Amino acid sequence: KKISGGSVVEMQGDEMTRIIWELIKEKLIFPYVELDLHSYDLGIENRDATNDQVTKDAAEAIKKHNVGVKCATITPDEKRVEEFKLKQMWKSPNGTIRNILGGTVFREAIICKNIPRLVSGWVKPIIIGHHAYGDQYRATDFVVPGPGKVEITYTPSDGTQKVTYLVHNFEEGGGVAMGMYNQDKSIEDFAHSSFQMALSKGWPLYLSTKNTILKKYDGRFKDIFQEIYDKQYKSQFEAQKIWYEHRLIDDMVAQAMKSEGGFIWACKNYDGDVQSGSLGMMTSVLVCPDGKTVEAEAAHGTVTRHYRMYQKGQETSTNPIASIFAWTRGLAHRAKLDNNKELAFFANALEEVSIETIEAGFMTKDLAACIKGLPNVQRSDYLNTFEFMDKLGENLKIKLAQAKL
Amino acid sequence: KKISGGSVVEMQGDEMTRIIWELIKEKLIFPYVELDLHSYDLGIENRDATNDQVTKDAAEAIKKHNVGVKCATITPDEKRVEEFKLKQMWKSPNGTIRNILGGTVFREAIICKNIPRLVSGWVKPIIIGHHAYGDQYRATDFVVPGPGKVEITYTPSDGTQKVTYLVHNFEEGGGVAMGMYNQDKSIEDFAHSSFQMALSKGWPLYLSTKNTILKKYDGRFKDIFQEIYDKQYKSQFEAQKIWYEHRLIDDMVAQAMKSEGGFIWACKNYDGDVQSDSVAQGYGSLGMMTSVLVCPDGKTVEAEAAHGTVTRHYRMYQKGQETSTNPIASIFAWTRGLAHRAKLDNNKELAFFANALEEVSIETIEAGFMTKDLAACIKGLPNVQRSDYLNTFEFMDKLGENLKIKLAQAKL
Ligand SMILES: NC(=O)c1ccc[n+]([C@@H]2O[C@H](COP(=O)([O-])OP(=O)(O)OC[C@H]3O[C@@H](n4cnc5c(N)ncnc54)[C@H](OP(=O)(O)O)[C@@H]3O)[C@@H](O)[C@H]2O)c1
Ligand SMILES: NC(=O)c1ccc[n+]([C@@H]2O[C@H](COP(=O)([O-])OP(=O)(O)OC[C@H]3O[C@@H](n4cnc5c(N)ncnc54)[C@H](OP(=O)(O)O)[C@@H]3O)[C@@H](O)[C@H]2O)c1
Ligand SMILES: CC(C)(C)CC(C)(C)c1cc(Cn2ccnc2)c(O)c(Cn2ccnc2)c1
């Protein structure tokens, strides 16, 4: 008999990822696990037909069932509106889901011993989580057309005296100015998600800020994380031989480079600054502050360029790893919530099979290019999308047979 | 006779870099060039003894003489205060010098054909620029202790046409808020140094902003850069088959991965130091990363390695243990400074020397003679053998021998 997997919210997607998502379910998941599957079709055509109601319903199902596994989806732009004759330029499903669930997104690149990394010494991945914006949240920027004062004021609701801070006195010429803010609740949610993420992995957590420059703004993140740690998580961390520390950004960057990895890094970037492989190896998880709800997905898109080749009947070599790890992370979380030992073993075995297959020299073109360099990759160095899924399927059957005896 | 090099401001530093700096002068510079050397000792003990007056005097000397070449220095922290029994936790000399000089910092990793790069396709380096804002430049941040309204207002000098913008209405708790700004003059100075660097190198220039999000704030950078390009640099760029293009970070990153390098990237970021740069701190070797502070005037340049004093190697050297410290970034601080001096003075012999030394440095590594950090890039640290590299002194001797040959060949 198959493993009884319980409740999983699954969101089908678009283009190349939609094809790979179906192959994963048919070849890797369904032959071994029976799920009470709450399946939502987030294909662009279905979101258009339902006036995006499907997206909202999927988000509510994740909130109820605690486990979401999502396929990459098309975020409409002008060209997509014309391509599908869309009724509206629908908002990103990821944006809609994040707004309903809340939480922090943690990204992790899957490491294979034979695949070159930025730091060769990295044996274990580094999991990065950013303090992001709640999609509707913004900064108030404007042009300063000429000389004059820019001030920022706070008027207490409690009737106490208003406080005025001079931002800059433009004495000659103009420029630009802006106002930014953060609510304590957002910082607290960021801290809770980071501590829950570290406890779940059994890895230490680092928070980096620029509190030497933004003494009040970044000092608040530093203080809130330390207050929550001391009160709610410190005993739990010590019990798992892990820790939490604040590090100044400059000091944090250098330490990660001389490290073997295996830590969570919560990042509070300097506000207003710009922030930005193989993408097929990058996983993503939205971790809600409750420590109960997660939504897992590949960090890449729908791979439109490969989908166009597939539509023409041309051979493709699309990496399914990030999509497989969305399934394994969701199933591992489900197993943890349900104390399901068989499901926990399966989720770990599938991750090991995926890494082992690549480490044995069977991989898609993107990874063969990492090893050989794109100018020297030959057809014999890689497997096409379907051949690679078949190899994973064969290795998974072998792994699960060895596990039985 | 030696080359008459003119006025150079030199700043001596600390630990392992202080040792390399002396080797560079003794083996590579002094046998060929005579300088009117304005030498400042920025060693930690001398900064402590002079109450940091030496740092301020060195900054004023660069402003007077236009050419600065600086050795890495210790930035005091609590452990350093205890180690040297320092009088105060002296501020970073780099911070003090940048505050006095102003300007834009450009960082460039030296490429050798046999050394792996982040992107294999890169044949020519990528030069990344960030503007160096003064210590007087800051965001105005504060704690919001409870519910209430945060607004930001602009009151023009004459008192008319005031505008008040709601930032946020804190309805359920407190948090934090801040006001930030940028002056047109700062953006214009950044644009001028960037366009000029692109022309001086004969390379295209790219600017990245988040103008799709900060439509007014980042739009101003895009427009000032675009205006100065269209008006003052468009024809010169086309003449050299080079171009200026604004690009979003996402687009910039993707293009760079498919690029062969050889371009200047101006990044609008406040937090732009190499220390917070995950790519620069984690790829190959910091021993190959150069830095140049380019002042708005186009006349003043301060060159330095974009790494520290290499304390870990200095500790081994103190125990009499063999070290293999890469002097490339330090040598290029000298060659960039001397090339700038040559340009200001129309000194053809000095310009030739500065270029010849850069060529010798790259050629030596390309011929398979390198320090351990580079041998580890090729072989991987666990598989490096002693025969794959040269120690600090052996590598400097090899460079010295190759420089002598190069300059002798150039004479005939
Ligand atoms: N989380 C999400 O739902 C999400 C996120 C981002 C974008 N999107 C959507 O995705 C669509 C396409 O976006 P995009 O083309 O900019 O991004 P993308 O799908 O991430 O693909 C960009 C390129 O990265 C490479 N790549 C990405 N994933 C790969 C994989 N699994 N295997 C092999 N190569 C892979 C391919 O490079 P080569 O072309 O060199 O082969 C591909 O053309 C858009 O409609 C966008 O809205 C969705
Ligand atoms: N511009 C400046 O004056 C400046 C800049 C940064 C830091 N600092 C100061 O420098 C001191 C030491 O800082 P740190 O140890 O954090 O940074 P670091 O001097 O840059 O050295 C960090 C590590 O990078 C490698 N490395 C750096 N430069 C190298 C070179 N030329 N050749 C070979 N390997 C090289 C070494 O790695 P391995 O250990 O693996 O060999 C070294 O231990 C501190 O007092 C700090 O304040 C000054
Ligand atoms: C073209 C552009 C934008 C520079 C992107 C690119 C190519 C990814 C890139 C390249 C280098 C240069 N480098 C290579 C080895 N050592 C230094 C960087 O320092 C950063 C830093 N960074 C990280 C994030 N943003 C900037 C990014």
Swiss-Prot record, chain A:
| Phosphotyrosine carried by residues | Y40
Listed under GO biological process in this entry are: 2-oxoglutarate metabolic process; female gonad development; glutathione metabolic process; glyoxylate cycle; isocitrate metabolic process; NADP metabolic process; NADPH regeneration; regulation of phospholipid biosynthetic process
Q: What is its main location?
A: cytoplasm
Q: What class of enzyme is it?
A: oxidoreductase
Against SUPFAM superfamilies, the record matches this protein to: Isocitrate/Isopropylmalate dehydrogenase-like
Query: Domain of life, per the record?
Result: Eukaryota
Alphabetized UniProt keyword annotations: Acetylation, Cytoplasm, Glyoxylate bypass, Magnesium, Manganese, Metal-binding, NADP, Oxidoreductase, Peroxisome, Phosphoprotein, Tricarboxylic acid cycle
Q: What does the note accompanying the cofactor annotation read? A: Binds 1 Mg(2+) or Mn(2+) ion per subunit.
| Database matches in SMART domains | Iso_dh
- Record PTM text: Acetylation at Lys-365 dramatically reduces catalytic activity.
* Protein localization: Cytoplasm, Cytosol; Peroxisome
Q: Which reaction does it catalyse?
A: D-threo-isocitrate + NADP(+) = 2-oxoglutarate + CO2 + NADPH
The record's annotation in InterPro entries points to: IsoCit/isopropylmalate_DH_CS, Isocitrate_DH_NADP, IsoPropMal-DH-like_dom
* PTM annotation (Phosphoserine): residues: S380
Q: Name one GO cellular component term.
A: ficolin-1-rich granule lumen
Question: What are its E.C. numbers?
Answer: 1.1.1.42
User: Where, in this chain's numbering, is NADP(+) bound?
Assistant: T73, I74, T75, R80, K258, G301, T302, V303, T304, R305, H306, N319
Residues involved in substrate binding = T75, S92, P93, N94, G95, T96, I97, R98, R107, H130, K210
> Which of this chain's residues are annotated to bind Mn(2+)?
D250, D273
- N6-acetyllysine PTM positions: K79, K222, K231, K241, K312
User: What job does this protein perform?
Assistant: Catalyzes the NADP(+)-dependent oxidative decarboxylation of isocitrate (D-threo-isocitrate) to 2-ketoglutarate (2-oxoglutarate), which is required by other enzymes such as the phytanoyl-CoA dioxygenase. Plays a critical role in the generation of NADPH, an important cofactor in many biosynthesis pathways. May act as a corneal epithelial crystallin and may be involved in maintaining corneal epithelial transparency.
**Similarity-based family:** Belongs to the isocitrate and isopropylmalate dehydrogenases family.
How would you summarize the oligomeric state and partners of this protein? Homodimer.
What clinical condition is it connected to? Glioma: Gliomas are benign or malignant central nervous system neoplasms derived from glial cells. They comprise astrocytomas and glioblastoma multiforme that are derived from astrocytes, oligodendrogliomas derived from oligodendrocytes and ependymomas derived from ependymocytes.
* Protein name stated in the entry: Isocitrate dehydrogenase [NADP] cytoplasmic
Q: Which organism is it from?
A: Homo sapiens
Name the gene that codes for it. IDH1
